[PDB]
Amino acid sequence: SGFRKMAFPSGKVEGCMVQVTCGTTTLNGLWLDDVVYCPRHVICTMLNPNYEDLLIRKSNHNFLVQAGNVQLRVIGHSMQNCVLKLKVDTANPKTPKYKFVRIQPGQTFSVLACYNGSPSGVYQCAMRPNFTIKGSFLNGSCGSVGFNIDYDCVSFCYMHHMELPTGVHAGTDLAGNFYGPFVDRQTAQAAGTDTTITVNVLAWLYAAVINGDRWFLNRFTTTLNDFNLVAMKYNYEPLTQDHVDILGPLSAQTGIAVLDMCASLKELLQNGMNGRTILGSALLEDEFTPFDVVRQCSGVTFQ
Ligand SMILES: *[C@H](O)[C@H](C[C@@H]1CCNC1=O)NC(=O)[C@H](CC(C)(C)C)NC(=O)C(C)(C)NC(=O)OCc1ccccc1
């Protein structure tokens, strides 16, 4: 019973994190086997810099890799796109199974904020339809990573870099390429007009039933052709036959069918909610995927 904005067990992530500095400049980094990884802009001190040049005047003693009461020894370095693959003499003892993934705009990851090489708390986030994210990131959180867990793998899939004038962040995949049209320098950058992740407002709605909220369900069915045409006007993102089939597994369990919940949302977008709350939100939350709800509304575990 119940439903929360949970987040994965950030446990395996804490044992890989290392602080990294190169002057009056210190961020966070991620230690895997014998490499440390971090946003290549720790080497700077930001308008139109040129790290390629900056980095050819850098060394291996210029990088003080910090492992708490352990100093790690950059025996080598290089650069992949916008990440700094620092090689250190020692092999990370707390390294689990892992994969560098990239995620389609709409999915979800959890984040471990990290300060001076130290976890500060974990949260769950989602890749917005503009290739940005909404999180708590302060002056100091760079090098913090996003991750997902299928039991005993950690799918490293984001690394904080920068914040956009509206309050939103934007980082790289763990291979040095952002999500979006951004450059890790101090130039004029408008994030972009964002829409709603409709495939996730209806899975959340299903989670609302699973736990006894039915004031939005009805008897109407509807077609896509009209859903997608009513989705667009309230900025929502049209629905695919691809995104319906996933919900199917969750559609069966609830005796409803995916396009029956669709028209219920249409009557929510047109009328509102008029002073109620669906699952503790007087909003609609587009930040829950179907594999998230299956995961809480059954409890698939990880060890
Ligand atoms: C990295 O340690 C640090 C993390 C961020 C602090 C708060 N939110 C974060 O995620 N970010 C930076 O130091 C970052 C470095 C560059 C290379 C991106 C400049 N700087 C920023 O994110 C900052 C907040 C200074 N803004 C920025 O990059 O400029 C964007 C901009 C757009 C238009 C006009 C002026 C500035």
Tab-separated table of C-alpha atoms and ligand atoms in Angstrom:
chain	number	residue	atom	x	y	z
A	1	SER	CA	0.000	0.000	0.000
A	2	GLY	CA	1.113	3.584	-0.655
A	3	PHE	CA	3.235	5.198	-3.342
A	4	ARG	CA	6.342	7.385	-2.985
A	5	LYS	CA	8.815	9.304	-5.117
A	6	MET	CA	11.397	6.750	-4.054
A	7	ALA	CA	14.865	6.347	-5.491
A	8	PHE	CA	17.240	3.420	-5.928
A	9	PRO	CA	19.605	2.214	-3.183
A	10	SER	CA	22.437	4.735	-3.611
A	11	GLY	CA	24.589	2.333	-1.615
A	12	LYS	CA	26.992	1.054	-4.248
A	13	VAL	CA	27.553	4.614	-5.561
A	14	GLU	CA	29.037	6.016	-2.325
A	15	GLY	CA	32.014	3.645	-2.447
A	16	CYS	CA	33.236	4.921	-5.809
A	17	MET	CA	33.264	8.684	-5.229
A	18	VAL	CA	36.451	10.727	-5.011
A	19	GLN	CA	37.206	14.448	-4.763
A	20	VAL	CA	39.203	16.105	-7.569
A	21	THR	CA	40.992	19.485	-7.722
A	22	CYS	CA	43.465	21.306	-9.985
A	23	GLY	CA	44.060	24.699	-8.403
A	24	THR	CA	41.489	26.984	-6.850
A	25	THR	CA	39.056	24.531	-8.469
A	26	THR	CA	37.589	21.418	-6.827
A	27	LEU	CA	34.716	19.187	-7.962
A	28	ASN	CA	33.635	15.544	-7.472
A	29	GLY	CA	34.654	12.450	-9.435
A	30	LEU	CA	33.740	8.769	-9.889
A	31	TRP	CA	36.320	6.012	-9.301
A	32	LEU	CA	36.049	2.785	-11.297
A	33	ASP	CA	38.825	0.220	-11.135
A	34	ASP	CA	41.857	2.399	-11.898
A	35	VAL	CA	40.222	5.474	-13.461
A	36	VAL	CA	38.631	8.634	-12.071
A	37	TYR	CA	36.024	10.489	-14.126
A	38	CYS	CA	34.961	14.107	-13.856
A	39	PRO	CA	33.783	17.134	-15.858
A	40	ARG	CA	36.779	18.396	-17.802
A	41	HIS	CA	36.193	21.940	-16.556
A	42	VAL	CA	37.990	21.506	-13.225
A	43	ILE	CA	41.114	22.369	-15.238
A	44	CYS	CA	39.750	25.877	-15.903
A	45	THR	CA	39.385	28.931	-13.658
A	46	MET	CA	34.818	30.546	-18.110
A	47	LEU	CA	33.700	32.495	-21.163
A	48	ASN	CA	35.261	30.828	-24.224
A	49	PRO	CA	38.011	28.604	-22.764
A	50	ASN	CA	39.760	25.934	-24.817
A	51	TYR	CA	40.459	22.865	-22.670
A	52	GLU	CA	42.424	21.256	-25.465
A	53	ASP	CA	45.057	23.994	-25.063
A	54	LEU	CA	44.560	24.240	-21.282
A	55	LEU	CA	45.121	20.459	-20.936
A	56	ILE	CA	48.397	20.372	-22.920
A	57	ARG	CA	49.885	22.570	-20.162
A	58	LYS	CA	48.596	20.182	-17.417
A	59	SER	CA	50.463	17.295	-15.791
A	60	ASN	CA	49.755	14.261	-13.648
A	61	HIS	CA	50.692	15.943	-10.346
A	62	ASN	CA	48.294	18.810	-11.179
A	63	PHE	CA	45.392	16.443	-10.250
A	64	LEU	CA	45.108	15.818	-6.494
A	65	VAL	CA	42.744	12.868	-6.470
A	66	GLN	CA	41.197	12.663	-3.016
A	67	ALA	CA	39.836	9.450	-1.478
A	68	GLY	CA	39.219	10.762	2.025
A	69	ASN	CA	42.124	9.598	4.182
A	70	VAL	CA	43.685	8.268	0.957
A	71	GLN	CA	45.372	10.263	-1.810
A	72	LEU	CA	45.195	8.686	-5.282
A	73	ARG	CA	47.984	9.073	-7.811
A	74	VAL	CA	47.149	10.185	-11.349
A	75	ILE	CA	49.642	8.024	-13.254
A	76	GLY	CA	48.120	9.200	-16.522
A	77	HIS	CA	45.347	11.217	-18.047
A	78	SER	CA	43.581	11.911	-21.333
A	79	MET	CA	40.122	13.183	-22.346
A	80	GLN	CA	36.899	11.803	-23.876
A	81	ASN	CA	34.702	14.610	-25.244
A	82	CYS	CA	33.736	16.441	-22.019
A	83	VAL	CA	35.005	14.012	-19.348
A	84	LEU	CA	38.435	13.498	-17.772
A	85	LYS	CA	39.481	9.837	-17.618
A	86	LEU	CA	42.120	10.175	-14.918
A	87	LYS	CA	44.150	6.998	-14.481
A	88	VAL	CA	45.339	6.320	-10.912
A	89	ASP	CA	47.851	3.762	-9.629
A	90	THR	CA	45.367	1.932	-7.371
A	91	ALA	CA	42.320	-0.199	-8.211
A	92	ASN	CA	38.977	0.920	-6.726
A	93	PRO	CA	38.154	-1.816	-4.204
A	94	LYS	CA	34.406	-0.967	-3.990
A	95	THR	CA	33.719	-1.299	-7.728
A	96	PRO	CA	30.554	-3.216	-8.663
A	97	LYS	CA	29.096	-4.203	-12.020
A	98	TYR	CA	28.296	-1.281	-14.259
A	99	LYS	CA	27.470	0.052	-17.719
A	100	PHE	CA	27.757	3.507	-19.286
A	101	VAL	CA	24.291	4.066	-20.748
A	102	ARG	CA	22.533	6.948	-22.454
A	103	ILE	CA	18.819	7.491	-21.857
A	104	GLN	CA	15.959	8.550	-24.160
A	105	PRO	CA	14.326	11.816	-23.122
A	106	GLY	CA	11.508	10.708	-20.813
A	107	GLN	CA	13.056	7.953	-18.669
A	108	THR	CA	14.331	8.257	-15.092
A	109	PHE	CA	17.469	7.988	-12.952
A	110	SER	CA	18.343	8.656	-9.328
A	111	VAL	CA	21.096	11.076	-8.316
A	112	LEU	CA	23.687	11.167	-5.536
A	113	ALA	CA	24.579	14.746	-4.678
A	114	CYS	CA	28.218	14.866	-3.601
A	115	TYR	CA	30.270	17.530	-1.876
A	116	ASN	CA	34.056	17.507	-1.608
A	117	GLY	CA	33.898	13.810	-2.414
A	118	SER	CA	31.072	13.055	-0.018
A	119	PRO	CA	27.449	11.969	-0.532
A	120	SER	CA	24.935	14.549	0.676
A	121	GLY	CA	21.719	12.600	0.034
A	122	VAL	CA	20.041	10.806	-2.889
A	123	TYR	CA	17.060	11.627	-5.081
A	124	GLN	CA	15.137	10.471	-8.170
A	125	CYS	CA	15.061	12.503	-11.380
A	126	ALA	CA	13.858	12.303	-14.978
A	127	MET	CA	15.218	13.370	-18.362
A	128	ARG	CA	12.963	16.208	-19.472
A	129	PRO	CA	11.694	16.624	-23.054
A	130	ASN	CA	14.270	19.433	-23.466
A	131	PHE	CA	17.281	17.378	-22.327
A	132	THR	CA	17.398	19.023	-18.908
A	133	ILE	CA	16.509	17.992	-15.332
A	134	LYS	CA	15.164	19.550	-12.129
A	135	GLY	CA	17.231	18.874	-9.033
A	136	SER	CA	18.986	20.297	-6.015
A	137	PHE	CA	22.469	21.252	-7.189
A	138	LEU	CA	24.516	23.886	-5.364
A	139	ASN	CA	27.854	25.582	-5.844
A	140	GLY	CA	29.955	22.387	-5.531
A	141	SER	CA	27.946	19.422	-6.788
A	142	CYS	CA	29.684	18.820	-10.158
A	143	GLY	CA	30.979	15.320	-10.789
A	144	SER	CA	27.883	13.919	-9.037
A	145	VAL	CA	26.410	11.114	-11.190
A	146	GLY	CA	23.045	9.672	-12.163
A	147	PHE	CA	22.515	5.916	-12.006
A	148	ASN	CA	20.023	3.028	-12.330
A	149	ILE	CA	20.172	-0.509	-10.871
A	150	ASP	CA	19.025	-3.822	-12.355
A	151	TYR	CA	19.931	-5.975	-9.320
A	152	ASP	CA	23.737	-6.000	-9.489
A	153	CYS	CA	24.541	-3.578	-12.290
A	154	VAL	CA	24.808	0.223	-12.017
A	155	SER	CA	23.887	2.014	-15.233
A	156	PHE	CA	25.829	5.241	-14.943
A	157	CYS	CA	23.837	7.643	-17.067
A	158	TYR	CA	24.467	11.281	-16.116
A	159	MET	CA	27.138	13.614	-14.685
A	160	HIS	CA	26.327	17.088	-13.412
A	161	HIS	CA	28.050	20.024	-15.142
A	162	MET	CA	26.068	23.232	-15.196
A	163	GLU	CA	22.986	25.253	-14.267
A	164	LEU	CA	20.721	27.240	-16.805
A	165	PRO	CA	19.351	30.635	-15.779
A	166	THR	CA	15.875	29.271	-14.942
A	167	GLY	CA	17.197	26.960	-12.186
A	168	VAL	CA	17.658	23.738	-14.153
A	169	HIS	CA	20.774	21.658	-14.511
A	170	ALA	CA	22.347	19.830	-17.459
A	171	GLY	CA	25.192	17.321	-17.615
A	172	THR	CA	26.978	14.654	-19.684
A	173	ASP	CA	26.604	10.974	-20.076
A	174	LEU	CA	29.514	9.102	-18.511
A	175	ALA	CA	31.283	9.470	-21.831
A	176	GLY	CA	31.400	13.247	-22.106
A	177	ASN	CA	28.414	14.203	-24.326
A	178	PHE	CA	25.593	16.314	-22.958
A	179	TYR	CA	21.907	15.816	-23.201
A	180	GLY	CA	21.018	18.788	-25.401
A	181	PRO	CA	22.498	21.792	-27.186
A	182	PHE	CA	24.804	22.939	-24.398
A	183	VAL	CA	28.492	23.761	-24.053
A	184	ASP	CA	30.429	23.541	-20.783
A	185	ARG	CA	31.458	27.230	-20.982
A	186	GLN	CA	29.928	30.550	-19.835
A	187	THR	CA	27.895	31.629	-22.863
A	188	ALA	CA	24.279	32.632	-23.422
A	189	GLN	CA	22.135	29.494	-23.087
A	190	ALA	CA	18.351	29.253	-23.113
A	191	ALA	CA	17.338	25.783	-21.927
A	192	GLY	CA	14.171	25.376	-24.025
A	193	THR	CA	10.357	25.193	-24.062
A	194	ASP	CA	9.511	21.977	-22.225
A	195	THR	CA	6.453	19.739	-22.521
A	196	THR	CA	4.814	17.077	-20.373
A	197	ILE	CA	5.795	13.411	-20.509
A	198	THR	CA	2.342	11.988	-21.211
A	199	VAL	CA	3.494	8.351	-21.171
A	200	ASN	CA	4.274	8.950	-17.492
A	201	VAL	CA	1.131	10.842	-16.430
A	202	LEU	CA	-0.989	7.812	-17.247
A	203	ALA	CA	1.282	5.255	-15.558
A	204	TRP	CA	1.223	7.416	-12.425
A	205	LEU	CA	-2.576	7.475	-12.801
A	206	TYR	CA	-2.572	3.662	-12.803
A	207	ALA	CA	-0.486	3.796	-9.613
A	208	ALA	CA	-3.333	5.991	-8.335
A	209	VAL	CA	-5.862	3.233	-8.829
A	210	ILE	CA	-3.655	0.420	-7.397
A	211	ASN	CA	-4.067	2.386	-4.135
A	212	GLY	CA	-7.750	3.366	-4.137
A	213	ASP	CA	-8.209	6.655	-6.071
A	214	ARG	CA	-10.955	6.398	-8.702
A	215	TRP	CA	-12.535	9.828	-9.034
A	216	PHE	CA	-10.940	10.262	-12.486
A	217	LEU	CA	-11.965	6.910	-14.005
A	218	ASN	CA	-15.049	6.826	-16.193
A	219	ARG	CA	-16.890	4.878	-18.865
A	220	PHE	CA	-15.864	6.824	-22.012
A	221	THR	CA	-13.264	5.360	-24.282
A	222	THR	CA	-11.435	7.449	-26.846
A	223	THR	CA	-9.139	7.188	-29.856
A	224	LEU	CA	-5.582	8.397	-30.078
A	225	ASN	CA	-6.272	10.667	-33.112
A	226	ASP	CA	-8.307	12.883	-30.720
A	227	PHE	CA	-6.206	12.265	-27.617
A	228	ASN	CA	-3.040	13.346	-29.425
A	229	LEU	CA	-4.948	16.352	-30.797
A	230	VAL	CA	-6.126	17.259	-27.280
A	231	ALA	CA	-2.751	16.362	-25.727
A	232	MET	CA	-0.932	18.942	-27.855
A	233	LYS	CA	-3.111	21.905	-26.809
A	234	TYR	CA	-2.181	21.496	-23.129
A	235	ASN	CA	1.468	21.122	-24.201
A	236	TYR	CA	1.376	17.364	-23.622
A	237	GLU	CA	3.314	14.966	-25.762
A	238	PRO	CA	1.311	12.727	-28.142
A	239	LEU	CA	0.889	9.005	-27.399
A	240	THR	CA	2.278	6.182	-29.547
A	241	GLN	CA	1.095	2.651	-30.089
A	242	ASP	CA	4.621	1.931	-28.809
A	243	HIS	CA	3.900	3.619	-25.481
A	244	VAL	CA	0.510	1.919	-25.175
A	245	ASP	CA	1.846	-1.658	-25.312
A	246	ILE	CA	4.075	-1.099	-22.314
A	247	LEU	CA	1.171	0.099	-20.166
A	248	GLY	CA	-0.770	-3.032	-21.242
A	249	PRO	CA	0.753	-5.177	-18.479
A	250	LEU	CA	-0.475	-2.477	-16.141
A	251	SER	CA	-3.707	-2.119	-18.071
A	252	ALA	CA	-4.672	-5.759	-17.505
A	253	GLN	CA	-3.944	-5.655	-13.762
A	254	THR	CA	-6.399	-2.773	-13.415
A	255	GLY	CA	-9.233	-4.095	-15.576
A	256	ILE	CA	-9.022	-0.780	-17.466
A	257	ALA	CA	-7.618	-0.355	-20.961
A	258	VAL	CA	-4.992	2.197	-21.813
A	259	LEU	CA	-7.210	4.430	-23.975
A	260	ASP	CA	-9.893	4.395	-21.256
A	261	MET	CA	-7.482	6.144	-18.842
A	262	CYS	CA	-6.468	8.489	-21.718
A	263	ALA	CA	-9.893	10.123	-21.970
A	264	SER	CA	-10.041	10.355	-18.167
A	265	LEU	CA	-6.914	12.526	-18.302
A	266	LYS	CA	-8.567	14.552	-21.117
A	267	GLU	CA	-11.410	15.350	-18.731
A	268	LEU	CA	-8.792	16.333	-16.136
A	269	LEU	CA	-6.967	18.667	-18.523
A	270	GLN	CA	-10.282	20.374	-19.445
A	271	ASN	CA	-11.990	20.538	-16.015
A	272	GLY	CA	-9.021	20.437	-13.628
A	273	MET	CA	-9.399	18.690	-10.253
A	274	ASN	CA	-11.332	21.341	-8.329
A	275	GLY	CA	-9.660	21.012	-4.954
A	276	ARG	CA	-8.889	17.296	-4.618
A	277	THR	CA	-5.564	15.423	-4.568
A	278	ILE	CA	-4.571	12.365	-6.601
A	279	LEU	CA	-1.900	10.661	-4.453
A	280	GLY	CA	-1.042	13.722	-2.432
A	281	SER	CA	-0.542	15.964	-5.469
A	282	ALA	CA	-2.966	18.641	-6.576
A	283	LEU	CA	-0.924	18.392	-9.773
A	284	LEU	CA	-0.290	15.608	-12.265
A	285	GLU	CA	3.220	14.127	-12.006
A	286	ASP	CA	4.891	13.177	-15.307
A	287	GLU	CA	7.979	11.801	-13.521
A	288	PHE	CA	6.936	8.141	-13.041
A	289	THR	CA	7.648	5.466	-15.640
A	290	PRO	CA	5.703	2.191	-15.976
A	291	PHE	CA	8.713	0.188	-14.769
A	292	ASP	CA	8.862	2.437	-11.733
A	293	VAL	CA	5.239	1.739	-10.740
A	294	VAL	CA	5.559	-1.996	-11.355
A	295	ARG	CA	8.615	-1.695	-9.135
A	296	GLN	CA	6.867	-0.070	-6.192
A	297	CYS	CA	3.482	-1.712	-6.836
A	298	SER	CA	5.095	-5.129	-6.546
A	299	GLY	CA	8.492	-4.428	-5.035
A	300	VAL	CA	11.235	-5.807	-7.314
A	301	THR	CA	14.392	-5.745	-5.203
A	302	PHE	CA	18.138	-5.294	-5.721
A	303	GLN	CA	21.144	-6.762	-3.873
B	1	LIG	C1	30.155	22.715	-11.268
B	1	LIG	O1	30.887	22.439	-10.058
B	1	LIG	C2	28.996	23.689	-11.056
B	1	LIG	C3	27.702	22.950	-10.673
B	1	LIG	C4	26.491	23.894	-10.815
B	1	LIG	C5	26.372	24.823	-9.600
B	1	LIG	C6	24.877	24.957	-9.354
B	1	LIG	N1	24.250	24.078	-10.330
B	1	LIG	C7	25.117	23.273	-10.927
B	1	LIG	O2	24.847	22.196	-11.449
B	1	LIG	N2	28.768	24.472	-12.265
B	1	LIG	C8	29.641	25.319	-12.804
B	1	LIG	O3	30.615	25.767	-12.226
B	1	LIG	C9	29.361	25.737	-14.214
B	1	LIG	C10	30.673	25.813	-15.025
B	1	LIG	C11	30.521	26.166	-16.516
B	1	LIG	C12	31.652	25.600	-17.351
B	1	LIG	C13	29.272	25.535	-17.078
B	1	LIG	C14	30.473	27.664	-16.759
B	1	LIG	N3	28.678	27.011	-14.181
B	1	LIG	C15	27.365	27.138	-14.096
B	1	LIG	O4	26.631	26.184	-14.148
B	1	LIG	C16	26.828	28.545	-13.952
B	1	LIG	C17	25.756	28.506	-12.875
B	1	LIG	C18	27.955	29.500	-13.546
B	1	LIG	N4	26.216	29.062	-15.164
B	1	LIG	C19	26.693	28.898	-16.405
B	1	LIG	O5	27.334	27.923	-16.773
B	1	LIG	O6	26.390	29.930	-17.394
B	1	LIG	C20	25.174	29.888	-18.143
B	1	LIG	C21	24.797	31.263	-18.634
B	1	LIG	C22	23.876	31.402	-19.663
B	1	LIG	C23	23.530	32.679	-20.112
B	1	LIG	C24	24.093	33.821	-19.540
B	1	LIG	C25	25.012	33.676	-18.506
B	1	LIG	C26	25.354	32.400	-18.057
